[PDB]
Amino acid sequence: TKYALVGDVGGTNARLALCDIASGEISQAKTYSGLDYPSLEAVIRVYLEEHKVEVKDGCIAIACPITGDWVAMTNHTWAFSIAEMKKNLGFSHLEIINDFTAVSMAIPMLKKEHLIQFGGAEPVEGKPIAVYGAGTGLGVAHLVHVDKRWVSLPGEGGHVDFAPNSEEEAIILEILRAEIGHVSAERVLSGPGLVNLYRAIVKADNRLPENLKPKDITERALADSCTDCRRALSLFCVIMGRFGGNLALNLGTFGGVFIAGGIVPRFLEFFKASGFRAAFEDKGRFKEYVHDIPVYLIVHDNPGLLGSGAHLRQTLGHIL
Amino acid sequence: KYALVGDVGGTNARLALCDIASGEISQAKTYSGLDYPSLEAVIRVYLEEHKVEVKDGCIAIACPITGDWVAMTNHTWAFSIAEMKKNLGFSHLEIINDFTAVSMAIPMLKKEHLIQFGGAEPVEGKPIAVYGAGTGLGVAHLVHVDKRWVSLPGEGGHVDFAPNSEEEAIILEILRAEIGHVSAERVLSGPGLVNLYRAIVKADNRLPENLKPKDITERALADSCTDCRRALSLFCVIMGRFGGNLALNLGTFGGVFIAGGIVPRFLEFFKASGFRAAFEDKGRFKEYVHDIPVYLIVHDNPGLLGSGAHLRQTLGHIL
Ligand SMILES: OC[C@H]1O[C@@H](O)[C@H](O)[C@@H](O)[C@@H]1O
Ligand SMILES: OC[C@H]1O[C@@H](O)[C@H](O)[C@@H](O)[C@@H]1O
């Protein structure tokens, strides 16, 4: 039984792949729309019959809290019982994990080409790792090396309070608080949050935001067509740095801080020139605590899939 | 039979004996840092007074523990762990952060050392966060990895202050103008209370007094100063909110623990406060933290206890 099933579901998209159990290598990736199938189980059935593979074991990352046996997505209508699904497909193992648990578990598998460093020096081996990423949501997980085991620590850290550093970011906080209630980091660091930032800068200035999508703000910011857009993106990069630096301090993250691509590669050279690193380190006397911690942009295309394979293989008894 | 354990913070160094077989602490004594040129000196005084031979120690210190050089901000006192180990002739000399120590105590605390503030029951083997406001703001996490609890130190007290209202933002900007970066510790700590009090005053366009942290709690509890009362109220809410962020960030279904620094001296005020609703005030993620218990630790020496646990475990004992 050479392959296990691996997957990465985020709102409407479900990508399934094969992981070679011996090497952890990913192959035969294929994507489906969630709108076209009534459940994750149905798309797995289709994927498996459609290639011609027999699997016993699988691991699927989902972009929502995995809190127990019943999983209900927020950004799509799928809702399912893990145990019910494992039974129905006849698997021996069926791990459902959070998407950032999966991304954290890809970290040990990542090599230099997959990483772009933004500041700091070198990781201190065996020391904790933080991973986060702004996409549809703000994801955060942590990773620690205990013995020979990579231990991911999943959370919902994208939902902590947003911490403004300026009178300006504070007016933005007020505006968003006036309109929604609790303002989380996710409210500003994500696709939707980039748009929240734009609307709020424009609104702070008593003007009327146009109905822009995240790709629009990014598009105009890079093109220089919109100073509001460029301000939104600039602030986003700054809040991004501060947020990651907070994670570095909170768990003593000398093994490094990882950003899981998401929206960021869409604007790599803008990010590269931004205040990101300097926001990362802007921690008063604690600048020196975080100053040598490296940040890496993860640029693998499918870290969720890789991470799912890694998580499974460790569960299967393998050492990475 | 005996090992040396320690709890060094600021002005003071508390030293005691730990029974290596049971983990019990005895002969605790608290020395003033000002009266001594080094922690090593203090240790020699203590070990001279007590008539036991000790080759093993663990000292918890209220500062980041990176490598071999340990630099105290609240005293100075800076030292080499390797050098101290050598000078004193120890087999093992473990030097840990103070919240590392407190986290190591949690697994041996019994219901009398705990006072619960909301939520339900811990989910067994799930992560724990511990924090506490004292001379500084400490944070550490504990995770259950392969049959044992593992301590995750850090400097989580120094992350940005995250104001949730227009008023706390006004305080943020007031503190931002006077100093730079405003960390959570700027507001959740003894000195934090003074900062809150000053900022509350300046914001009502008045001039603050040169008050001390115990001044704040006294006048609050005596109800003899509406600015001090207000600061304390606000401290309780920020404390709840800060604890809620910790729980969200590491999924701490194991529970959140507060190490009593300044809190027990206003215990009933704290119980009456907005603490728990602030802890839970997380938008749609209210439900994620609603069942996570908070416990105040009322054990008098969690640092000494946890230094002992840390050392005994290092010496091969299963806890
Ligand atoms: O997609 C990244 C993150 O988005 C958040 O809104 C969800 O609550 C997390 O579970 C997820 O990891
Ligand atoms: O004493 C509580 C905390 O205070 C902070 O100021 C120090 O940086 C920490 O190392 C310590 O754990």
Domain ranges of chain A: 1-98+299-320, 99-298
Pocket mutation for ligand 1, best pick of A96, A140, A156, A187 (most atoms within 8 Å of C-beta): A156
Ligand 1 site, residue A186, Cβ cutoff 6 A: yes
What are the two backbone dihedrals, phi and then psi, of residue A38, each rounded to the nearest 5 degrees? -75, -10
Known binding-site residue numbers of B for ATP = 6-11
Residue B155 CB–ligand 2 contact under 6 Å:
yes
| Interface check B146 vs A, CB under 8 A | yes
Among the bound ligands, name the one nearest to the CA of residue B101. Answer: 2
Map chain A to HEC letters.
CCEEEEEEEECCEEEEEEEECCCCCEEEEEEEEHHHCCCHHHHHHHHHHHCCCCCCEEEEEECCCCCCCEEECCCCCCEEEHHHHHHHHCCCEEEEEEHHHHHHHHHHHCCHHHEEECCCCCCCCCCCEEEEEECCCEEEEEEEEECCEEEEEECCHHHCECCCCCHHHHHHHHHHHHHCCCCEHHHCCCHHHHHHHHHHHHHHCCCCCCCCCHHHHHHHHHHCCCHHHHHHHHHHHHHHHHHHHHHHHHHCCCCEEEEECCCHHHHHHHHHCCCHHHHHCCCHHHHHHHHCCCEEEECCCCHHHHHHHHHHHHHHCCCC
**Amino acid occupying residue A306:** L
Q: How far is B52 from chain A (nearest CA, A)?
A: 35
Q: Is A36:A86 a contact under the CB 8 Å cutoff?
A: no
Q: Which residues precede gaps in chain B, with C-N > 2.5 A?
A: none
- Looking at residue B224, the DSSP 8-state letter turns out to be -
- Cα separation, A64 vs A139, in Å, equals 9
CA distance B34 to B10: 10
Q: For residue B112, give the amino acid letter.
A: E
CATH topology of domain B98-297: Hexokinase; domain 1 (3.40.367)
* Residue type, position A155, single letter: G
CA A107/CA A111 separation, integer angstroms: 9
Quote the CA–CA distance of A240 and A275 in Å, as a whole number: 10
Q: What is the CATH T-level fold of the domain A99-298, as seen in this structure?
A: Hexokinase; domain 1 (3.40.367)
How close does chain A come to B197, measured CA to CA in Å?
Answer: 20
Compute CA distances B227 → A14, B77, B187, B263, whole Å: 56, 37, 15, 18
CATH superfamily assigned to domain A1-98+299-320: ATPase, nucleotide binding domain (3.30.420.40)
Tell me how close the Cα of A15 comes to any Cα of chain B, in angstroms: 27
- Name the residue among B269, B183, B277 with its Cα closest to residue B232: B269
Q: Is the domain B1-97+298-319 a CATH 3.40.50.300 member?
A: no
Residue B261 beta carbon below 6 angstroms from any ligand 2 atom: no
Cα dihedral across residues A32, A37, A40, A46: positive or negative = negative
Residues contacting residue B148 through CB under 8 Å, at least 6 positions apart: B313, B318, B319
Q: How far apart are CA A101 and CA A111, in angstroms?
A: 19
Range 169-208 of A in CB contact (< 8 A) with B: 170, 173-174, 177, 180-184
Question: Are the C-beta atoms of B100 and B306 separated by less than 8 Å?
Answer: yes
Distance CA B200, CA A169 (A): 21
Which residue's CA lies nearest to atom 12 of ligand 2? B138
State the first-to-last Cα distance of chain A, in angstroms, to the nearest integer.
19
Ligand 1, pocket-test mutation among A62, A105, A138, most atoms within 8 A of CB: A138
Three-class DSSP category at B55: coil
What sections of B61-212 are H helices per DSSP? Answer: 81-88, 98-105, 166-178, 190-203
Q: Which residue of A has its CA nearest to B137?
A: A250
Q: Which residue of A has its CA nearest to B165?
A: A174
Residues 6+ apart with CB under 8 A from A284: B158, B179, B180, B181, B183
A7 marked as binding residue? yes
| Number of CB pairs, chain A paired with chain B, less than 8 A apart | 130
Q: Which residues of B are annotated as a binding site?
A: 6-11
- Residue B52's Cα: distance from chain center in Å? 30
Cα separation values, A299 from A270, A280, A296, B231, Å: 16, 20, 9, 47
Is A104 within 8 Å of A64 (Cβ atoms)?
no
Q: Do B249 and A161 touch (CB under 8 A)?
A: no
User: What's the CA gap between B22 and B319, in Å, rounded?
Assistant: 10
**Distance of CA A285 from the midpoint of ligand 1 (Å):** 32
The answer to whether B195 and B179 are in contact (CB under 8 A) is no
CB B143 within 8 A of CB B270: no
Residue B135: its H or E element: none
